[PDB]
Design an enzyme around this catalytic site. Structure first.
Site, PDB file in Angstrom:
ATOM      1  N   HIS A  79      -9.817  -5.070   8.541  1.00  0.00           N
ATOM      2  CA  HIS A  79     -10.573  -3.993   7.910  1.00  0.00           C
ATOM      3  C   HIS A  79     -11.683  -3.365   8.754  1.00  0.00           C
ATOM      4  O   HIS A  79     -12.856  -3.370   8.364  1.00  0.00           O
ATOM      5  CB  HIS A  79     -11.160  -4.494   6.591  1.00  0.00           C
ATOM      6  CG  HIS A  79     -10.133  -5.014   5.636  1.00  0.00           C
ATOM      7  ND1 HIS A  79      -9.811  -6.350   5.544  1.00  0.00           N
ATOM      8  CD2 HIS A  79      -9.332  -4.374   4.750  1.00  0.00           C
ATOM      9  CE1 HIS A  79      -8.860  -6.513   4.643  1.00  0.00           C
ATOM     10  NE2 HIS A  79      -8.550  -5.328   4.145  1.00  0.00           N
ATOM     11  N   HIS A  81      -8.295   0.172  11.733  1.00  0.00           N
ATOM     12  CA  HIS A  81      -7.517   0.281  10.500  1.00  0.00           C
ATOM     13  C   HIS A  81      -7.806   1.628   9.847  1.00  0.00           C
ATOM     14  O   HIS A  81      -6.901   2.310   9.374  1.00  0.00           O
ATOM     15  CB  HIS A  81      -7.890  -0.848   9.535  1.00  0.00           C
ATOM     16  CG  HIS A  81      -7.371  -0.657   8.139  1.00  0.00           C
ATOM     17  ND1 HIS A  81      -6.031  -0.714   7.824  1.00  0.00           N
ATOM     18  CD2 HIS A  81      -8.021  -0.438   6.970  1.00  0.00           C
ATOM     19  CE1 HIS A  81      -5.876  -0.544   6.524  1.00  0.00           C
ATOM     20  NE2 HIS A  81      -7.068  -0.375   5.980  1.00  0.00           N
ATOM     21  N   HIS A  93     -12.347   4.988   3.452  1.00  0.00           N
ATOM     22  CA  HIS A  93     -11.745   4.092   2.464  1.00  0.00           C
ATOM     23  C   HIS A  93     -12.105   2.611   2.588  1.00  0.00           C
ATOM     24  O   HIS A  93     -12.068   1.886   1.598  1.00  0.00           O
ATOM     25  CB  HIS A  93     -10.216   4.280   2.425  1.00  0.00           C
ATOM     26  CG  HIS A  93      -9.442   3.247   3.191  1.00  0.00           C
ATOM     27  ND1 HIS A  93      -9.295   3.284   4.560  1.00  0.00           N
ATOM     28  CD2 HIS A  93      -8.772   2.146   2.772  1.00  0.00           C
ATOM     29  CE1 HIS A  93      -8.569   2.251   4.952  1.00  0.00           C
ATOM     30  NE2 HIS A  93      -8.241   1.543   3.885  1.00  0.00           N
ATOM     31  N   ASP A  94     -12.461   2.158   3.786  1.00  0.00           N
ATOM     32  CA  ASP A  94     -12.825   0.757   3.962  1.00  0.00           C
ATOM     33  C   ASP A  94     -14.170   0.534   4.656  1.00  0.00           C
ATOM     34  O   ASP A  94     -14.495  -0.601   4.996  1.00  0.00           O
ATOM     35  CB  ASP A  94     -11.735   0.012   4.751  1.00  0.00           C
ATOM     36  CG  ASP A  94     -10.620  -0.537   3.861  1.00  0.00           C
ATOM     37  OD1 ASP A  94     -10.862  -0.765   2.664  1.00  0.00           O
ATOM     38  OD2 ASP A  94      -9.500  -0.761   4.364  1.00  0.00           O
ATOM     39  N   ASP A 117      -2.593   3.369   3.662  1.00  0.00           N
ATOM     40  CA  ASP A 117      -3.319   2.106   3.711  1.00  0.00           C
ATOM     41  C   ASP A 117      -2.307   0.956   3.752  1.00  0.00           C
ATOM     42  O   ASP A 117      -2.521  -0.035   4.445  1.00  0.00           O
ATOM     43  CB  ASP A 117      -4.246   1.996   2.484  1.00  0.00           C
ATOM     44  CG  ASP A 117      -5.229   0.830   2.573  1.00  0.00           C
ATOM     45  OD1 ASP A 117      -5.878   0.635   3.629  1.00  0.00           O
ATOM     46  OD2 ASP A 117      -5.368   0.113   1.565  1.00  0.00           O
ATOM     47  N   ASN A 174       1.314  -0.372   7.520  1.00  0.00           N
ATOM     48  CA  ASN A 174       1.653  -1.204   8.668  1.00  0.00           C
ATOM     49  C   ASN A 174       3.026  -1.908   8.588  1.00  0.00           C
ATOM     50  O   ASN A 174       3.668  -2.131   9.613  1.00  0.00           O
ATOM     51  CB  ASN A 174       0.513  -2.205   8.981  1.00  0.00           C
ATOM     52  CG  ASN A 174       0.218  -3.158   7.841  1.00  0.00           C
ATOM     53  OD1 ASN A 174       0.847  -4.211   7.714  1.00  0.00           O
ATOM     54  ND2 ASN A 174      -0.745  -2.793   7.002  1.00  0.00           N
ATOM     55  N   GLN A 193       4.756 -12.160   4.354  1.00  0.00           N
ATOM     56  CA  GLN A 193       5.098 -10.801   4.738  1.00  0.00           C
ATOM     57  C   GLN A 193       6.298 -10.324   3.938  1.00  0.00           C
ATOM     58  O   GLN A 193       6.330  -9.194   3.459  1.00  0.00           O
ATOM     59  CB  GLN A 193       5.390 -10.729   6.233  1.00  0.00           C
ATOM     60  CG  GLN A 193       4.155 -10.985   7.096  1.00  0.00           C
ATOM     61  CD  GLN A 193       2.961 -10.134   6.672  1.00  0.00           C
ATOM     62  OE1 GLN A 193       3.046  -8.908   6.616  1.00  0.00           O
ATOM     63  NE2 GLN A 193       1.841 -10.789   6.372  1.00  0.00           N
ATOM     64  N   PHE A 217       5.169  -9.857   0.372  1.00  0.00           N
ATOM     65  CA  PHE A 217       4.353  -8.658   0.306  1.00  0.00           C
ATOM     66  C   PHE A 217       5.227  -7.406   0.323  1.00  0.00           C
ATOM     67  O   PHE A 217       4.995  -6.459  -0.445  1.00  0.00           O
ATOM     68  CB  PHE A 217       3.375  -8.641   1.482  1.00  0.00           C
ATOM     69  CG  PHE A 217       2.401  -7.495   1.446  1.00  0.00           C
ATOM     70  CD1 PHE A 217       1.723  -7.178   0.275  1.00  0.00           C
ATOM     71  CD2 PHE A 217       2.157  -6.742   2.582  1.00  0.00           C
ATOM     72  CE1 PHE A 217       0.823  -6.129   0.242  1.00  0.00           C
ATOM     73  CE2 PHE A 217       1.260  -5.693   2.554  1.00  0.00           C
ATOM     74  CZ  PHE A 217       0.592  -5.384   1.381  1.00  0.00           C
TER      75      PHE A 217
HETATM   76  N1  LIG Z   1       0.282  -6.677   6.609  1.00  0.00           N
HETATM   77  C1  LIG Z   1      -0.205  -7.116   5.447  1.00  0.00           C
HETATM   78  N2  LIG Z   1       0.192  -8.331   4.999  1.00  0.00           N
HETATM   79  C2  LIG Z   1      -0.281  -8.765   3.818  1.00  0.00           C
HETATM   80  N3  LIG Z   1      -1.122  -8.158   2.971  1.00  0.00           N
HETATM   81  C3  LIG Z   1      -1.503  -6.956   3.451  1.00  0.00           C
HETATM   82  C4  LIG Z   1      -1.109  -6.377   4.645  1.00  0.00           C
HETATM   83  N4  LIG Z   1      -1.710  -5.135   4.808  1.00  0.00           N
HETATM   84  C5  LIG Z   1      -2.432  -4.991   3.727  1.00  0.00           C
HETATM   85  N5  LIG Z   1      -2.350  -6.051   2.858  1.00  0.00           N
HETATM   86  C6  LIG Z   1      -3.016  -6.203   1.566  1.00  0.00           C
HETATM   87  O1  LIG Z   1      -3.158  -4.918   0.983  1.00  0.00           O
HETATM   88  C7  LIG Z   1      -4.538  -4.707   0.604  1.00  0.00           C
HETATM   89  C8  LIG Z   1      -4.866  -3.243   0.727  1.00  0.00           C
HETATM   90  O2  LIG Z   1      -6.264  -3.044   0.573  1.00  0.00           O
HETATM   91  P1  LIG Z   1      -7.218  -2.866   1.837  1.00  0.00           P
HETATM   92  O3  LIG Z   1      -6.391  -3.308   2.978  1.00  0.00           O
HETATM   93  O4  LIG Z   1      -8.367  -3.754   1.530  1.00  0.00           O
HETATM   94  O5  LIG Z   1      -7.536  -1.410   1.834  1.00  0.00           O
HETATM   95  C9  LIG Z   1      -5.325  -5.616   1.534  1.00  0.00           C
HETATM   96  O6  LIG Z   1      -6.583  -5.950   0.961  1.00  0.00           O
HETATM   97  C10 LIG Z   1      -4.411  -6.832   1.670  1.00  0.00           C
HETATM   98  O7  LIG Z   1      -4.601  -7.799   0.658  1.00  0.00           O
HETATM   99 ZN   LIG Z   2      -7.566  -0.399   3.983  1.00  0.00          ZN
HETATM  100 ZN   LIG Z   3      -9.883  -1.507   1.087  1.00  0.00          ZN
END
Ligand SMILES: Nc1ncnc2c1ncn2[C@@H]1O[C@H](COP(=O)(O)O)[C@@H](O)[C@H]1O
Ligand SMILES: [Zn+2]
Ligand SMILES: [Zn+2]
Ligand SMILES: Nc1ncnc2c1ncn2[C@@H]1O[C@H](COP(=O)(O)O)[C@@H](O)[C@H]1O
Ligand SMILES: Nc1ncnc2c1ncn2[C@@H]1O[C@H](COP(=O)(O)O)[C@@H](O)[C@H]1O
Ligand SMILES: Nc1ncnc2c1ncn2[C@@H]1O[C@H](COP(=O)(O)O)[C@@H](O)[C@H]1O
Ligand SMILES: [Zn+2]
Ligand SMILES: [Zn+2]
Ligand SMILES: [Zn+2]
Ligand SMILES: [Zn+2]
Ligand SMILES: [Zn+2]
Ligand SMILES: [Zn+2]
EC number: 3.1.4.53
Lengths: 327, 334, 327, 334
Positions: free
Chosen positions: C75, C79, C115-116, C233, C236, C284, C287
């Site tokens: 974060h 990102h 956003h972050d 967001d 990836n 992964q 997810f």
């Molecule tokens: N590559 C990833 N693998 C697992 N969880 C992910 C991944 N990328 C994002 N996330 C999850 O998606 C959420 C999106 O919110 P944020 O990244 O905080 O903006 C994150 O807080 C993680 O919990």
């Molecule tokens: Zn994010």
């Molecule tokens: Zn976030």
């Protein structure tokens, strides 16, 4: 309309020490700070000197005054209006004529307008003792004063409220620094020091061929503005008894209420805050003899004799209360 | 104040007024005068004692009184409606709702504590104006809460925040589990007081009243959390919009206050050239129409659905509401 | 001039989905967010469109970027730079050509770059469990998202950073509401509904004669921007493997660090955060199956067939990981 | 539960390192690596156990460790100098200074607790930039604290604020008087770490030395709070400016870190188009020359004065300083 004529007649004494500020509050629907500030702003052509849109100023002034507590007997919009108007008159003193710039004058006036905004009606010490968030935020140092400056400025950022939108960076920055300096000086824990400096400044007084004082560096120019606004804030005892009396009953009401509050939580009742062991008369004479008079005596010696009547008025109020003292 | 633990002869009158705590229509305004403008502190103390909340949650009395007074000190005396009287009113009203036959022994002490606590802090530090006003004026409050449930978020923040002042943490003895549960429910309840959540809340309540399962005692049966918190959320929501259901002498006092507050806002909005909010123009006022409008589209649909949920328990309250509507119809100048 | 020519060339892929964002991080001097933003803004002629002084723009981007923690592995500015550029490409998607207005486009891009901002490296539940100040301020609801927004805006008030200074009182109110709507939509607890609504809208999809997506009311228009930034967001896993893996390692390092922090405090350890009971690969896949795929499966629908290579990379990337799951 | 506050598999070596906790020159960087980047938690824990503070102030162990980890967590790991290692260093230095013979039995336990606690939080949540930089950008911080001692007021607020996180109130068992006394001292001590107060702070210390009084026991006689707090303020201030008096191996690491941070600011300052601050220009850097200047005009005048107050206790400290000064002198490229 009649109600408006009476207001205008009252507003005519805006440049006079002794304005019927309470009368004015009654007639403007409880908007004394707004009317007095707007009136003082035209008398000083400030709106034009700084290109302040009419609607913006009113909107800000209404907002600031809205952030003063109507349930607080003393620290409210009337007291704000009063210190503003008092500083306004102190600024026009002959011994200081031409000494300050439009920016420095706009500072002492704005500062006075916000010097007690959002005052809770209790002392710094009460905020500290109860562990209020405010006290934690400012580390027990000038909690209220820091908060007053904070709300005063923050309110500028409201919709159509920035009355300094047309100032310049160099100006806004200078104004900001001066207001902070002035308001922080209103903290009574700084009194003793402010007076000492004031005295030292009177024992090195420097006048010009124009008889008016000479203020070289910033340290001296601000030190006068601080004592000036400080004098205005502690000016109720030097006003016509009719006014002083209303202020005293109002201040006491607030101290007693703080006292009740402390007696509610079982705290030690603060000084002068106990309605069952009070000496309103004694306190007033005490407040004048150890703080008000020692301060104003020094102010008179600075703008000698521009404030001879003010001091005289103070000494007479001092006696009025004295000849009322029982035991 | 009592000479030898024995009441004062005013504090006594207060005590006798407080014998109607379990009744709809308590003379809350009198209690406010009698208690020295401490209706919130005394009614909360009365309720905590009766519901035995201090012993159950090991809340020291001093800490409770200190917090209560601190909480009440944070309501604005210069606000006609959203003040400590409205808070005390909402607390006592929720208290009476909780004691309804249809909900007898349904909620745990922790849920009861949350309903009452949430009621007490629900409008704390209300500035006298609406969310919309704080938003359109660019208040720091609105910016902090990104214009969403501004006031409701602030009331909650302040209610909890005050627990941190000297001798104010009335929950010091609750385990972390009890505190996390209490806290989530209190937050869920106060956010539900925002009117913008009104429709959805009512919809789910009707949906509940439809699929409503009961008995074992003839009392409501609440399964999961979504259901229990939903009922409690509507319960406090009903207490907050209960003034139209109280005896007329009470109701009108509430109306004068809210209208006054609405006009003060209209006045302030006007001074700034802002569009005047509904019911706020003291010049084009329709007090009688407003109340009827408010009772037909909001209050009655809500209490009718609530009367269904706990029927017959809320028949008298629904009647008083229906009766106060007619009364206002008459008053309507034609 | 050595790594500069190399950085320019690398930016030639700006409107391309798969940017070597990490190289741009090094070559730019750890300013991936500032550069990608400066380029993208000039391209959409947003500087001239809203009269954004080249100064201010860069000064805000730098204040914002600096407010991303360099210690956080995931974060951070990279990102944020990644999401802004991913969003950029998504806005230039054909099936959506000429749908959103210059103001709505600015929102989306602005919402992404903030956003972050100021993410602490720990989840909301962690902040909630510890009674962090941030959680007490926002009542355990979208704690970090509310904070992200609050810092995004407040950072405008810094020194010469108020980019939206040349917009109207009507524009600024629109943008503001859109940015807030977008950022709060990134909170995962909002995911389910955002997807259900995005799907429901794909079911009742409507276009004009030219085939331009027809977004009638605000509800619809913002719901598309919300999910769009949400897809960015959560993009990836849909980027070329080489990228996806770096991101996955970075987020797992953050997860594990949170896990170690919870372990030290005797707190329950969140899922995926326990480096002793880890299943990085199973995670992964999990997810991607429960969240990334269902989200991207629908966005591809809406912009059929703009996003297909993206979706295909996703299914391929899932396979590469699934083949790494032992037992 | 673990031996030194935290979990570590290299516990043996950490144990031997912490044995020098009462000596000037502790291998703090090594303890930082062995502790798993928990130098502040481990050193604070060691000092509290060693001084029996947990028992004296009834501080629960778990509350102390939880608070310590929280406090440490709030120092930025990306800041080269003002981090948890600096915090740990200053705490340990203050601890040594408090144990000086000339001050034996002079300070109460509450004053000792205050000086140590103040040292642990003195730079918490440092952004990595000076107050000037925060002021010249109109940062929310420089505005909340009316441009006066921005960082210092913030360090104090955060430090005290963290006491409110779960199980972090290490002062929960002190009386109201003890908590109010502790708070004022801590506040007075940290504000005094603002360099803008150095000169005045040093003058007052000299005035004290010139009129230095000793008791029946060769220890300083400090009557009023003013002299007491003054000593404590200069003491922590010395600890904060103690790196130039540590073994050269340590001093050099501190100089590299401080410069790396000054250069991070120098860069940012020229980006936003600002006047580069002193010692922040990594293109025209006179590092060695700077140390010589810093020692000559600030550190040496300060330590020479502290040394007279506790003569001869700090003779070796003053000697090492002078050796380090001459070392940089011979490094300066002309
Ligand atoms: N590559 C990833 N693998 C697992 N969880 C992910 C991944 N990328 C994002 N996330 C999850 O998606 C959420 C999106 O919110 P944020 O990244 O905080 O903006 C994150 O807080 C993680 O919990
Ligand atoms: Zn994010
Ligand atoms: Zn976030
Ligand atoms: N008439 C008065 N009688 C007694 N004390 C006063 C009077 N007027 C002002 N003061 C004191 O002067 C202080 C000035 O600070 P403030 O009231 O915050 O402006 C008040 O807080 C009072 O303590
Ligand atoms: N007597 C009433 N007449 C009209 N509107 C009311 C009345 N009582 C409550 N309301 C409305 O319902 C809202 C309830 O929220 P509050 O009382 O602010 O928690 C009020 O803000 C008003 O908008
Ligand atoms: N090794 C050093 N070289 C130069 N200046 C230093 C050194 N150590 C400390 N200082 C100065 O002393 C100040 C102490 O403040 P702080 O480090 O913020 O507590 C630093 O900000 C520097 O200005
Ligand atoms: Zn004041
Ligand atoms: Zn005042
Ligand atoms: Zn409300
Ligand atoms: Zn309410
Ligand atoms: Zn410092
Ligand atoms: Zn330091």
């Amino acid at each position: 309309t009649e109600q408006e004529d009476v207001l205008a007649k009252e507003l005519e004494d805006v440049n006079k020490w002794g304005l019927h500020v309470f009368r004015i509050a009654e007639l403007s629907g409880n908007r004394p700070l707004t009317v007095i500030m707007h009136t003082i702003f035209q008398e000083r052509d400030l709106l034009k000197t700084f290109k302040i849109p009419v609607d913006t100023l009113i909107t800000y002034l209404m907002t600031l005054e809205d952030h003063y507590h109507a349930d607080v007997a003393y620290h409210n919009n009337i007291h704000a209006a009063d210190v503003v108007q008092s500083t306004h008159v102190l600024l026009s003193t002959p011994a200081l004529e031409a000494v300050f710039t439009d920016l420095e004058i706009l500072a002492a006036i704005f500062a006075s307008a916000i010097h007690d905004v959002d005052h809770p009606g209790v002392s710094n010490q009460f905020l500290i003792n109860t562990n209020s968030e405010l006290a934690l935020m400012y580390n027990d140092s000038s909690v209220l004063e820091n908060h007053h400056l904070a709300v005063g400025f923050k309110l500028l950022q409201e919709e159509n409220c920035d009355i300094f939108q047309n100032l310049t960076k160099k100006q806004r920055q200078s104004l900001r620094k001066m207001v902070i300096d002035i308001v922080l000086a209103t903290d009574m824990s700084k009194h003793m020091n402010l007076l000492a400096d004031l005295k030292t400044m009177v024992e090195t007084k420097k006048v010009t061929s124009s008889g008016v004082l000479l203020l070289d560096n910033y340290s001296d120019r601000i030190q006068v503005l601080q004592n000036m606004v400080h004098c205005a804030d502690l000016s109720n005892p030097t006003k016509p008894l009719q006014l002083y009396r209303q202020w005293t009953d109002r201040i006491m009401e607030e101290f007693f209420r703080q006292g009740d509050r402390e007696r509610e939580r079982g705290m030690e009742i603060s000084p002068m805050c106990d309605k069952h062991n009070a000496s309103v008369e004694k306190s007033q004479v005490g407040f004048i003899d150890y703080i008000v008079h020692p301060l104003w005596e020094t102010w008179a010696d600075l703008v000698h004799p521009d404030a001879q009547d003010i001091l005289d008025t103070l000494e007479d109020n001092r006696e009025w209360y004295q000849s009322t003292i029982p035991q």
